[PDB]
Design a protein around this nucleic acid. Structure first.
Lengths: 283, 256, 236, 47, 236, 283, 47
RNA sequence: AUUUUUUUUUUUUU
RNA sequence: AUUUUUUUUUUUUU
RNA sequence: AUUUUUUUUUUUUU
RNA sequence: AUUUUUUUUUUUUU
């Protein structure tokens, strides 16, 4: 329980209880009222005085949503750009619209609630590889540029937008990490994990996806020039939430996700409730 | 009380300007011109203050406002370089600083339509009409009281003369961040702009550097009534204010 | 320069590390908080809410009928349901209790089990809901379950019984993943007398099973759950 | 019962700091008892 | 040696990081400040100044005429102008408000829209300047725009109307880049009665449109603007 | 608004306003006075009491001009100097006259004002590349020497001026950065973004370009000797302004720049005002 | 409402320090109302 | 859901 | 030539 | 049209 | 722009 807190040992778990022959029955309830009665074990059995040596601190939503999780894995390489028309398709640079709903493990922890508001902590890890024949490992530097909506998008890896006089960017080495903090950047007072609405009253506009859970976008490149070989740099973005506030606890999702921002689930999906190996009376 | 914001009088020296359909006076950056204080001063020479002989209204030549007319630009102190004792001290001295009161005349009738943008621009560096790294020669940024007619032709070594791009690559609509005043013929016939001394130095050469430039620009085109002459005169009258001169010598010679 | 020495673990990225880091958006002023209802501060707040148990698992596909425990009339001494109390598996696995329980490795405390009768108001029954503490097998007749933690439920105007499963364990914490050493026991229900239906009513009536956590409940050592997976990343 | 000493913030922004800590607010009653009439335990729920 | 541990992000170059660094010129004494007028402390100071809107965009090349809204005489119930209120695009894009607005991602607050009449002093007009809040379409007759935020402007000795666009939004901030969800609405002007010219005057008279920001204005999350670019570096 | 500041919640955004039937009209104005009247929404419509939860801190000119921006990209290499006459043309060393008007993005933010005075923070990043065949990546050290006007200029990479007994220089590794602070080094009390003048009264002297916005010059080299291969080192200089003061707000530039220190724009340039896709009455 | 602790300057020069911070001066009136006669709001601008 | 109206005095623009 | 500037308070038009 | 909102205390059904 | 001159006493070189 959490009713009474003592002095010699605090926050009793169960109080000492004895036999009952009484006209008040705490275990008879109506759940047609939409309420859960706080029935303790001392209302049904005879109990002994035990204490909680527990605070309930790891189940705080600051702790629950506040560890780093991989939200995006993208890939760029450092090759010769002479003769390439599309630098994005050749992955000389690559950008990512920031969302926390692409790894489903963080997405389920987020979508236990309807609205969440937090400051963001990003950690970006870059690891290289040379799958083709090479004489050495290149000493490469990655630029991650945080591109807000309405900012000019990069067309090439050596394009003028990478100079970033207003856009925040970070320059770090491959094999290392870059860690930076981004505040709560929602237009409203909280992000929307779910949106039962549209951008406007239109018959062909998109459902559910919204700029209420818009968190910006970051674009990646390698600042170095090309070598004799080709080296592939894999970039993993890690997000840690902090100063978390959350609202409206929702039902957990059991069917798999299919998209970003949609609640859609695949057709002909498998049953998620485990069928009993026997009948209902079987343990 | 019972006075007007329309009826104004400016008296400076032995010169007096009256107006009866003014709008206000604009004081540039809410600051009256002053003499150089001792805390800001660097030059050790005692300055010369000729006040009565030089801080007085000088009337520039008149400009004809036509429908196809683009605008006019004047540089200060370059416009007042042949004007009396002020222009003489401007050449006999190596240094000098000055504030200005600019009063632009354009009167019409109540049947007339049209609007002028009178604007003072600090450090109005002009663009060459050729682009690249071509510079503007000395005589084309120092025309005198004649000013720069912006409706004239492109000439070699001179500035660009597109009134839209303000002769420096910025559009004409955003020129109202500079201290400005309109002359609307239905409302206004004069514009008064009082300029302090705006520089990054305490005192500067008055012959190799123009501190401000004055642009009179017709935004709305001139519409005369039916049968009227398709023309109005525009007159500019500038008076130096709180003028100091320092480092007197033997009258440097400028080009032309 | 202050003379320093760098320790083993310099340059590591620990995902659970709680440090400070530079703000990429200096002087940014976020949107002010308005009052939104239903604010969650702790996951121990929202597991004390009852949610239905899909306990009629005897269906080839998932159904609404999986939440309905069938109840037959004029039966005597029989069994209504029975399950083990691994709350991170089985009937409890898709439940809001047992979907937050699988976010943590250890659990401790008392469970709160409910049953709601949804037959006619002119009907009557008496059922016995029993909890078997660990060490013994699952009870196979009513007298076996009668020797454990049980309540006799008289069905009447109040349609719900609430029978808590009290914390009967030697060790202080149980694994949320099913483990034989930290097993929790067994749960079953039996006919105490019978189900009597009123005249001109035939067929089956149903029970609705709920589970929640007591304020006695503890939950520690956060892990990743087995209820979701993906093989490729999602696109917008 | 020691106390940690890492309370010096190095940056100027509040988004730059570390995690807020446990709320110790702990109100399950707005989900468990969201009812209009207060419902005692032991009393009949209805009438 | 003080035992230290280096964190992830050691040796990174963040462009927005505000730290200290060694001075390459020790004991250097810079030039003392003199008083220069017109000192700017904040970009919210200089966007409360009106600048002209190039709103007559119907020209194949940029003109002075682009700043003049034409106004015809003896017209009734017609439309003078109309635009959307994306202030980082369209007619507002080259404006001093809308060139500082594109240095930031989010904007909030009230706009200040002005109109100056430049016809003859013996002329008269009545115009109705209306703001349509978002959700509805752009108004296509005067009665549609009459149902929104409007002012009736009597043209007289005072030549300017100042009709603020007040902050009518559910969300607290709008994107400066045009976005459908954070759209701002529509702005238009109509003839309330007519334009009456005096005798012996023919032709068109003109309006001059201004925009500035109220002290209500907010502007956050600095970005790079789209108004300039280069393909090669410049040389002296 | 910013008129009244309350105690319970500070700096109201709009005051509560009601219907007006009055002889004072705040919305009728003369902009022929050259002034902007501070007309609030409460002078036209009926408003409600709202608060600014905003300070106007990111639009401070210390913040606006105070992030690092790339002002120069130059290139040097570490090759065999035996047989080379001009070391500057072979890019064994390369110098740069310090200016902030070569990247146009910082230049437009600077040229919103006429005079600016600030201390400078330089960050120099050096990245190498071996485009030809090489057995290893060289471990190179870059010298960046700050060369004031009147100092001897380097003629060779191994020339006597690199010893720098008076000139400040920094020695850092390729792949790393060097960060140093330079004070305000203008001859006058502020720099000149614009100069309507000449160096002297001459008919052929240059217009606009001046030593009032003179910030020194820094010369680059690689301290290491030559290897068997050729390695190209690209050097990017980043400038952050601090302790910024600014004067005389100017019209923003919309036409593209062509030179350094000139206000020139290209002939036959495109229109910068967007033409309407329709008529004037079209939304 | 925490306060940052990074107020220790490590170098001897004032150019070596970090950014100055917000001015909180905020005077738009020298650009918005640079006029000689004070102009009230509500009053006629002229005469 | 113990809320609704009657009307007082104070604050924002007189 | 013992004069020059810094700035006070009073008078003429407020 | 000197009205609008912020919120106090009293009255009608607790 | 509420500034200009008349002249006082103090400071820098007596």
């Amino acid at each position: 329980e959490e009713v009474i807190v003592e002095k010699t040992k605090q926050t009793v778990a169960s109080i000492s209880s004895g036999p009952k022959h009484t006209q008040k029955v705490p275990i008879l309830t109506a759940n047609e009222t939409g309420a859960t009665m706080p029935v303790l074990p001392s209302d049904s059995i005879e109990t002994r005085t035990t204490y909680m040596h527990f605070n309930g601190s790891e189940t705080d939503v600051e702790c629950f949503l506040g560890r780093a999780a991989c939200v995006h894995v993208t890939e760029i390489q450092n090759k010769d750009a002479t003769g390439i028309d599309n630098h994005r398709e050749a992955k000389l640079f690559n950008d990512w619209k920031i969302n926390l709903s692409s790894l489903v493990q963080l997405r389920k922890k987020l979508e236990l609630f309807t609205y969440v508001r937090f400051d963001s902590e990003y950690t970006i890890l870059a690891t290289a590889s040379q799958p083709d024949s090479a004489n050495y490992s290149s000493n490469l530097v990655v630029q991650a540029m945080y591109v807000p909506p309405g900012a000019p998008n990069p067309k090439e890896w050596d394009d003028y937008t990478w100079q970033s006089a207003s856009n925040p960017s970070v320059f770090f080495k491959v094999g290392d990490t870059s860690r930076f903090s981004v505040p709560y950047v929602g237009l409203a007072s909280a992000y929307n994990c779910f949106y039962d609405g549209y951008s406007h009253d239109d018959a062909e506009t998109q459902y559910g996806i919204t700029v209420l859970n818009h968190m910006g976008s970051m674009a990646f490149r390698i600042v170095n020039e090309h070598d004799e070989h080709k080296t592939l740099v894999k970039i993993r973005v890690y997000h840690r939430a902090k100063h978390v506030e959350a609202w409206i606890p929702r039902a957990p999702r059991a069917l798999p996700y299919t998209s970003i921002g949609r609640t859609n689930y695949p057709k002909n999906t498998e049953p998620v409730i485990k069928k009993r190996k026997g009948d209902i009376k079987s343990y | 009380c019972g006075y007007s914001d329309r009826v104004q009088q400016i008296t400076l020296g032995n010169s007096t300007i009256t107006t009866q359909e003014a709008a206000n006076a604009v004081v540039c950056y809410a600051e009256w011109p002053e003499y150089l204080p001792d805390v800001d001063a660097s030059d050790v020479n005692k300055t010369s203050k000729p006040d009565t002989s030089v801080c007085r209204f000088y009337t520039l030549d008149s400009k004809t406002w036509t429908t196809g007319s683009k605008g006019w630009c004047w540089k200060l102190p370059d416009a007042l370089k042949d004007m009396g004792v002020f222009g003489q001290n401007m050449f006999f001295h190596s240094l000098g600083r000055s504030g200005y009161t600019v009063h632009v005349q354009c009167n019409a009738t109540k049947f007339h339509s049209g609007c002028l943008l009178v604007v003072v621009i600090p450090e109005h560096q002009l663009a060459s009409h050729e682009g690249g790294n071509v510079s503007v020669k000395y005589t084309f940024t120092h025309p005198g009281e004649r000013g720069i007619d912006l409706s004239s032709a492109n000439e070699v070594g001179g500035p660009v003369k597109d009134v839209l791009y303000n002769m420096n690559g910025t559009l004409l609509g955003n020129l109202l961040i500079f201290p400005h005043q309109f002359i609307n013929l239905r409302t206004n016939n004069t514009a008064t702009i009082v300029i302090p001394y705006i520089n990054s130095v305490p005192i500067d050469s008055m012959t190799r550097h123009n501190n401000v430039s004055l642009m009179v620009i017709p935004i709305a085109p001139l519409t005369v009534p039916t049968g009227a002459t398709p023309s109005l005169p525009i007159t500019v009258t500038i008076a130096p204010m709180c003028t100091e001169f320092s480092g007197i010598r033997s009258k440097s010679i400028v080009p032309q | 320069g202050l003379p320093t020495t760098t320790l083993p673990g310099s340059g590591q990225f620990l995902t659970t590390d709680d440090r400070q880091s530079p703000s990429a958006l200096p002087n940014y002023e976020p949107t002010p908080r308005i009052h939104i209802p239903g604010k969650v501060h702790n996951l121990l707040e929202i597991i004390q809410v009852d949610t239905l148990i899909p306990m009629n698992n005897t269906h080839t596909k998932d159904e609404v009928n999986s939440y309905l425990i069938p109840l037959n009339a004029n039966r005597q001494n029989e069994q209504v349901f029975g399950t083990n109390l691994f709350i991170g598996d089985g009937v409890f696995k898709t439940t809001l209790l047992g979907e937050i329980v699988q976010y943590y490795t250890h659990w401790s405390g008392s469970l709160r089990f409910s049953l709601m009768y949804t037959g006619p108001a002119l009907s009557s029954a008496k059922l016995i809901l029993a909890y078997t503490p660990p060490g013994a097998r699952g009870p196979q007749d009513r007298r076996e379950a009668m020797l454990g933690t049980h309540v006799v439920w008289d069905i009447g105007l109040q349609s719900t019984i609430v029978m808590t499963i009290p914390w009967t364990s030697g060790v202080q914490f149980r694994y949320t993943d099913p483990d034989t050493y930290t097993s929790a026991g067994f749960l079953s229900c039996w006919y105490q007398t019978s189900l009597i239906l009123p005249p001109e009513t035939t067929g089956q009536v149903y029970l609705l099973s709920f589970i929640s956590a007591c304020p006695d409940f503890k939950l520690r050592l956060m892990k990743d759950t087995q209820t979701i997976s993906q093989t490729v990343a999602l696109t917008e | 019962s020691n106390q940690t000493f890492t309370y010096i913030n190095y940056y100027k922004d509040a988004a730059s700091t570390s995690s807020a800590g446990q709320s110790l607010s702990m109100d399950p009653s707005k989900f468990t008892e969201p009812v209009k009439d207060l419902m005692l335990k032991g009393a009949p729920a209805l009438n």
